Structures are given as structure tokens and as C-alpha cells.
Design a protein around this ligand. Structure first.
Ligand SMILES: CC(=O)SCCNC(=O)CCNC(=O)[C@H](O)C(C)(C)COP(=O)(O)OP(=O)(O)OC[C@H]1O[C@@H](n2cnc3c(N)ncnc32)[C@H](O)[C@@H]1OP(=O)(O)O
Ligand SMILES: O=C([O-])CC(=O)C(=O)O
Ligand SMILES: O=C([O-])CC(=O)C(=O)O
Ligand SMILES: O=C([O-])CC(=O)C(=O)O
Lengths: 273, 157, 273, 184
């Protein structure tokens, strides 16, 4: 009642700019939900409005959807899907199973996106040619992450790297960082034939290329969302689809609680403490 | 060249340190005097990163940028001619010497009482050499009704 | 080496049917990733392939995307987004912040989807008219969940209930359960004007309607994914977009660690134990 | 059957050294659970056996229990307990509520323990006196973490800092780093 009459001030915390639940209708960035549906923007459109607060162009939103669908699943033997299947098989709900699978996503599992994006961004922004960049990575004792596949090497392409790469070639306006990464893989395939750009590296370099190459980004914000970790959100949001599918599959097959075999442990406990 | 007009309605200031109560009282004094612009342009605190602090301009929420270093606060706000040093008795001397390297500052109010007299004499000598007016130390500040208030003088509204 | 020659059997656990990471290219249900991209199916297409293992029709996939985008965010004052902002504001990464926000999604927050779907499914499958159904819910002492909005009542529609409802009316082939829920809200708005179908109820009834009304579902599988909890996966996957946006927003505004005020606690501790 | 006769090798992953679930009885480090209970070691004893794989002495185990009980709670207005109350109040179970509260624990909330330990360890191991150490922290532009309380200052001690400090003074054999932090 005393704030209705406006005779008090309370310091309002919890500053936000991605949703306006009050009023008449839902407003994501500055535009209502009916204008979201009337302009026929996809799910990449609402990632543009919710994560970046900007109306991305149609090729950028379609590319965001495209890099979500290739990220959707990569089998159950990966570590997060293994966690999802273990937690779902122990009688838990969807939230706990998906959550225990998502918490595996860190630096080793799914960390090639953001770190590969930062690696190629720091390579391209510092003015180093790819021939010197590969030697600098070799003599610093760490691998170029985002580059290197196990089996599929030369005239046997990854076939989802190819689709994303083709869509970036015809639809993006200018591709400096993608061409830089193409030169780096042209060097590393001359080294060993299976050192191609992964999907984890190509989504990263094309996402940085999209942010710093299309409109509405002012060249500190395009380099800020990389540092905050918007590449990780793409991977986690994409792989949540496959993890929920893994939960529904392990609950539909009706499989009882898993216990690991004792012959796959090799206990090395001390003799007596 | 010590100027005879220290504060006016166009007077902006940089507060050195986390004194959000003092900055809120500053903004309240600026709002009650029917002044168009806030007199706090930026805040300098070396122990935190560059961010924004949420303050009141009457009823409205406004953002005052808090900077880690002093140089970026001086570059982004060239209209600042007042620095109010809320540093302690051992960190006021070096902060005042760092302030006086910038030629835009015409007055510094040093609020902290305690400083040794030889360092204060060095401050006085450089103030006479540069023309910067130093209000203090060991003061609560100075108030000009209608134009500007320094720190905690007067009190709340 | 002894499994290459085929002179041993090991019982292979971890049965799965949603991804084939081996071989040449990625296979989701039975179709490769290049056929996924060549047929131009959306993100609803890969939810159809990963969660249900079926090629859903184009209106079903577009409706799945449509019910994902309305679910994307509903402000920061909801409980899960509050958890996301608290965990992101305490210096955590994207996975921990999104995870701590997603774990709030249960029966009270976000539970209206699956429970409203099950409620209207058990109402429609048991052959009870809506006039008897409303009285049965009233005299059992529990509310019809999925029905009832706070402010927006009559000739002031929810404006995302309207878009989803319109898309179901022109694009779905047959709508028995949606018309049943329309009759139930026609009764409850005659009771009190703000008792309309929520978006949480309309997505649920239209999702059950989609599974039991379109092709490729054999009338036990359309009722099985409701029991497993495929409605919860829709809500969690949709709201993960807004939660990652909340993480990026609270990290971009650079806000320090939150501590609750002591005047909003009201401690009721005992006198001495 | 072919591993019972020992005519195959499978590379066994998942190396561990903190529990032996097989056999007769539970073995934590190298000692059985009945020897754990017969020697009357506390919960600090099983943190010694499970985390460090060593039989810590009685004062060390009692100090581990002691530093567990002061860490037990610090009110609901802290950020993790706020997350716990929010998740528990939304109808979730114990695991989800405790989990959503525990995920808040990072660098800002609860990060003063490990970072303060590393800060004083790097100060003491590098041979810097506390007078130079405080000036080095001041002129690097970051605070000494683990030092600084809001209200309780001088002849008004924290009263759980005092109990832990007293127990370390009479019961620990040698305290170089504690005396270094006392000088700081
Ligand atoms: C009647 C009347 O009222 S008339 C009033 C007139 N008289 C006066 O105005 C004199 C009063 N003086 C003052 O008010 C004070 O001197 C003020 C305004 C400058 C405030 O200063 P303080 O709060 O003491 O100092 P501050 O908050 O900066 O902290 C002191 C030190 O703590 C250090 N510190 C803070 N946190 C930490 C930490 N976690 N670890 C280590 N050091 C820390 C600070 O870095 C600072 O170090 P420094 O002194 O080398 O800079
Ligand atoms: O994303 C990763 O780094 C791991 C992964 O899915 C793969 O096995 O290719
Ligand atoms: O689905 C729910 O119950 C929560 C929600 O988003 C809302 O407040 O509308
Ligand atoms: O452990 C921390 O850093 C936070 C905490 O409990 C406190 O408020 O003292």
C-alpha cells in the first residue's frame, strides 16, 4: 500500500533483461510473443532474443537450429549419455537423469566447442599465420583442440561437418575465421590425414564467425559472449535433446538397476592402514 | 592557477572507494536541488572489477560505473574536475598523487583523518605546484547548496 | 583379439535405440544425418527421431518447435529461473547454473504439463462428460490443473494459448481431447472468468492429442510416453533456453554474490534445546 | 567362464583405492570395518581412511569432526541455503533440494576455504614475511581472502574461530602456518 502511493524506495536487486512476464503479453527482448510468431522466426530466433537480446537474421537463426541438430546426440558410450542412462536406469525421474547427464559436460566432455572457439579466436586476433600457429601449438606441448577425428580422414568426410560447412559457405556473408581454420586443417591433414576440423571445432569457429561477421554486434559483444560461454550453452541445449531421449528409451525398455562388474575395477587398496 | 569557482551545477565528481551510502546521499542532494544531471560520474575501487552500481535518481534506478583503475575512469569521463578520495589514512597519499597526474582534476577532497604531516606537506607542495585545490584532510567535506555536496556533510536529507 | 575371431560371448548390457555413433555417419532412428538435413526437418524432427524413434509429419514437428518456443521463458521470478540466477550470480559455470535451475522443475514448478495431460487423458478415456468431470474434480477436493490464470480472463486471451490453439485447429487432423478441454474451460469460465486453459494445460492436451491423433503411433505407445514423462522433457528442454539466457545475462551484467535480507526470514527457532 | 579358467585378459579400467566391497567385510584403506569400530575412530577417522587413505591420529580426526561441525550451517540468507529452501519449497525431494543448494558452492560462496589455504600456503612457502605479504596483496589489487569479518572485530571474537584456534594450540604438535596467519 505504501509502494502504491510511492512514498518509499526499496533497492530492487535481480536485474534482468530477457523476459517481461508482467503486462499483457510475453516480451522476450523488446518484441512481443505474437510478433515472434508472426515474423516466423525459428527456435534460433528465440535463442537470439533470449541469449543475445537481438533479432538475428534468418540465416543466423537457421544456422543456430542447424548447429543444435548436429549436437543433438552422439551415442550412449559418451560420458554424459552414460551418466543419463545410469541415472535413468536407477529409477529416477527425467529431471534427475538429464541433470546427472548434463553435469558431466565440462572441459573434457563437450569442452572442445568453447575452447576451440577461444583458441582460433586468439590465433586469428593476434595476427599469426596458420603455418606459424601450428608450430606454436606443437612447441607449447598442447594439441589444437577442435581438430582431429579418430577414423574419418580424407575423401571420407564427417558428413555433418560438410553440411554445416556448406551452409556457412553459401549463406554467411564473410568468413575470415572459417577460412583460417580451413588453412589450419589443410596443414594438419598434410601432417596426419585424420586431423580434420571436428564438428566441435567447426561449430565453434563458425559461431564466432557468425557473431563477429553478421549485423547487430558491436565487436566487443561478439567477443564477450565467447568469454562468458555461449558456446557451452549451444552444446548443452543441443545434447539435452539426446539425453531426454536416452531417459525415455531406458524407461521404455524397462531395464533394472545397473551394477558394474567386479572384473572391471582392479582394486589397488593399500595393505593395512 | 587556483580557480575561484570550485563547484557549480555542471560539476561532476569521482568517488574513490566503496562509499555507496555517501554516493546515495550525493544523488539525493542532487535530486532535491532540482539539478538535471547526477554529480557522480564514476567510482574507483582497485579491489574489484569494472561493473555498474545501482543507485537512485529520485524514483528512478540509474547505473554508476565502477572502475578498477583510475585511467579508464578518467578517459571515459573527461568532464570530471572533482575527485573525492575516501581512501584510508595509508592509501590516500598514493591515490592523491595518482589523481594529480591528470590535468582535468581541479579539486580533491581528502576525507581521511590520520595522514602523517610530512605526506600532507608533500600534497600541499604538489597542490601549489599544480594549482589543484585540496579540501582536507580530516574533513567531512564541503557543501554548496543548489550545486554540489562533498561526502557526508549535512547528513541525510 | 578373441572377440574378433568370435570364440567368446560377453553379455552386452546398455541397450539403446536412439543413436548409432559407429559406422560411416550418424543414424538417429534408422535414417542418416544427411537424410535428416536433406528432408529439411526441423528441431521437432530430431525430437521425433530421438525421443519417439519415428518420422513425425511436418505439422507435428512444427508444433513441437512451436510448443518449445512458448515454453522458452516466463520471467525471472519463477522458481527455477530464480535458482539459475542465484547459482550464476555465485560465480558458477553454465552447467552448474542451468543444472541448479533445472532441478527446481518438479511437481509444483512445471508439473502442470504432464499432470494436466494425464488428468485430461484419464477424464477422456473413462467416458465422463465435462459437466460431470468438473463436479467430480470439485467434490474430490483438488483443482483441475492446467486450468486457471491469474489476470487474463475473458476477451483478454493469453495470446500464446491463442497461437498454439489456432495452429492445432487448422493443422491437426482430428482434435477430440482439445475439444474436451475447450468444453471444460467453457464450464469453468462460466464459474469464474479467469479459469481458462493455461499454456501448461493446452500444450499437454494438444501433445496427447498429437500422439494419439496423428500417424505412426499404435495407441499403446501414444499412452506410454505420457506415463514415462515426455511432457516433462518438452518443458525442461524449452525452459533450458531461458535458463541459459539467464546465466549469460547475469554474467554479462557482472553482478556480485547475492545474500538474502535478514528482514525477509522471520526466524522461529526454539528457545533452548 | 573363460575368465574363471584364466585364458583371457581384459584391460580393467576404473582404478580405485578407497573401498573393497568384495570379500568378507568392508575394507576402507587397508583395515576392515570391524577394526574401524574397535579402534573407536570417529567420522574424522573415516574421512582419513576414505579421502587420504591414512590412519590419522586422534587429534587430527577430532579436529576434522570439529571443522565439520562449525561448517554445518550459517543461516538461510546465504546463497546455497537459499537455493536449498527454494528447491525444497517447490515440492522436490531431498536429493534435488540438497543438490541444487550444493551446486551454488563455488568460488564466491564457500570458495574462501581452498583459496585462503592456497594463498597462505603460497605466502609461507615462498619465504615472504607477513609485513611484505600484506603490502604485496594490497599493491596487486586483490584482497586477502579468509580475512575480514563484517561486525565482530576486537575483544568480540568470532567464538568458533576461538574454539578451533584453541584446539589447534593445545593439540597440534607444531603450528608454523597458523602463527603466520596470526601475524597477518
Ligand atoms: C563528528 C564527525 O563525524 S566529524 C568527521 C570528520 N573526521 C573524519 O572525517 C575522519 C574519519 N575517517 C574516515 O572516515 C575514514 O578514514 C575513511 C572514510 C577513509 C574510511 O576508511 P577505512 O574504511 O578505514 O579504510 P578502508 O575501508 O579503505 O579499509 C582499510 C584497509 O582495509 C584493507 N582491506 C579491506 N579488506 C581487506 C581484506 N579482506 N584483506 C586485507 N585487507 C583489507 C583495505 O584495502 C584498506 O587497506 P589500506 O588501508 O592500505 O588501503
Ligand atoms: O564433444 C566432445 O568433445 C565429445 C564427443 O561428443 C565425441 O565423442 O565426439
Ligand atoms: O509451469 C509452471 O507451473 C510454471 C510457469 O512457468 C508459470 O508460472 O507459468
Ligand atoms: O563460506 C562462505 O564463503 C560463505 C558463508 O558461509 C558466510 O556467509 O560466512
Amino acid at each position: 500500500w505504501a509502494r502504491e502511493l510511492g512514498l518509499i524506495r526499496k533497492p530492487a536487486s535481480f536485474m534482468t533483461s530477457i523476459c517481461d512476464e508482467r503486462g499483457q503479453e510475453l516480451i522476450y527482448a523488446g518484441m512481443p510473443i505474437t510478433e515472434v510468431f508472426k515474423e516466423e522466426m525459428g527456435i534460433g530466433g528465440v535463442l537470439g532474443l533470449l541469449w543475445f537480446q537481438k533479432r538475428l537474421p534468418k540465416y543466423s537463426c537457421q544456422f543456430i537450429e542447424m548447429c543444435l541438430m548436429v549436437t543433438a546426440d552422439h551415442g550412449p558410450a559418451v560420458s554424459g549419455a552414460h551418466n543419463t542412462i545410469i541415472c535413468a536406469r536407477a529409477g529416477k525421474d527425467l529431471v534427475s537423469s538429464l541433470t546427472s547427464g548434463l553435469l558431466t559436460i565440462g572441459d573434457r566432455f563437450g569442452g572442445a566447442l568453447d575452447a576451440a572457439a577461444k583458441m582460433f579466436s586468439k590465433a586469428f586476433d593476434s595476427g599469426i599465420i596458420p603455418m606459424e600457429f601450428v608450430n606454436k601449438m606443437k612447441k607449447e606441448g598442447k594439441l589444437i583442440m577442435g581438430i582431429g577425428h579418430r577414423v574419418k580422414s580424407i575423401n571420407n568426410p564427417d558428413m555433418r561437418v560438410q553440411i554445416l560447412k556448406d551452409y556457412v559457405r553459401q549463406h554467411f556473408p564473410a568468413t575470415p575465421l572459417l577460412d583460417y581454420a580451413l588453412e589450419v586443417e589443410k596443414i594438419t591433414t598434410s601432417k596426419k590425414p585424420n586431423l580434420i576440423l571436428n564438428v566441435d571445432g567447426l561449430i565453434g569457429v563458425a559461431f564466432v564467425d557468425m557473431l563477429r561477421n553478421c549485423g547487430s554486434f558491436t565487436r566487443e559483444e561478439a567477443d564477450e559472449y565467447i568469454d562468458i560461454g555461449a558456446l557451452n550453452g549451444i552444446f548443452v541445449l543441443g545434447r539435452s535433446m539426446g539425453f531426454i531421449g536416452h531417459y525415455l528409451d531406458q524407461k521404455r525398455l524397462k531395464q533394472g538397476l545397473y551394477r558394474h562388474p567386479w572384473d572391471d575395477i582392479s582394486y589397488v587398496l593399500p595393505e593395512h592402514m | 592557477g587556483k580557480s575561484t569557482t570550485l563547484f557549480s551545477r555542471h560539476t561532476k565528481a569521482i568517488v574513490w572507494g566503496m562509499q555507496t551510502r555517501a554516493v546515495q546521499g550525493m544523488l539525493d542532494f542532487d535530486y532535491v536541488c532540482s539539478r538535471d544531471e547526477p554529480s557522480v560520474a564514476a567510482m574507483v575501487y582497485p579491489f574489484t572489477g569494472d561493473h555498474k552500481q545501482k543507485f537512485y535518481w529520485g524514483h528512478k534506478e540509474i547505473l554508476i560505473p565502477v572502475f578498477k583503475n583510475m585511467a579508464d575512469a578518467m578517459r571515459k569521463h573527461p568532464e570530471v574536475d572533482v575527485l573525492i578520495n575516501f581512501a584510508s589514512l595509508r592509501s590516500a597519499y598514493d591515490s592523491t598523487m595518482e589523481t594529480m597526474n591528470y590535468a582535468q582534476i581541479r579539486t580533491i577532497a581528502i576525507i581521511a583523518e590520520g595522514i602523517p604531516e610530512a605526506l600532507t606537506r608533500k600534497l600541499i607542495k604538489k597542490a601549489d605546484q599544480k594549482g589543484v585545490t585540496i579540501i582536507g584532510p580530516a574533513t567531512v567535506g564541503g557543501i554548496k547548496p543548489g550545486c554540489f555536496k562533498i561526502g557526508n556533510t549535512g547528513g541525510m536529507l
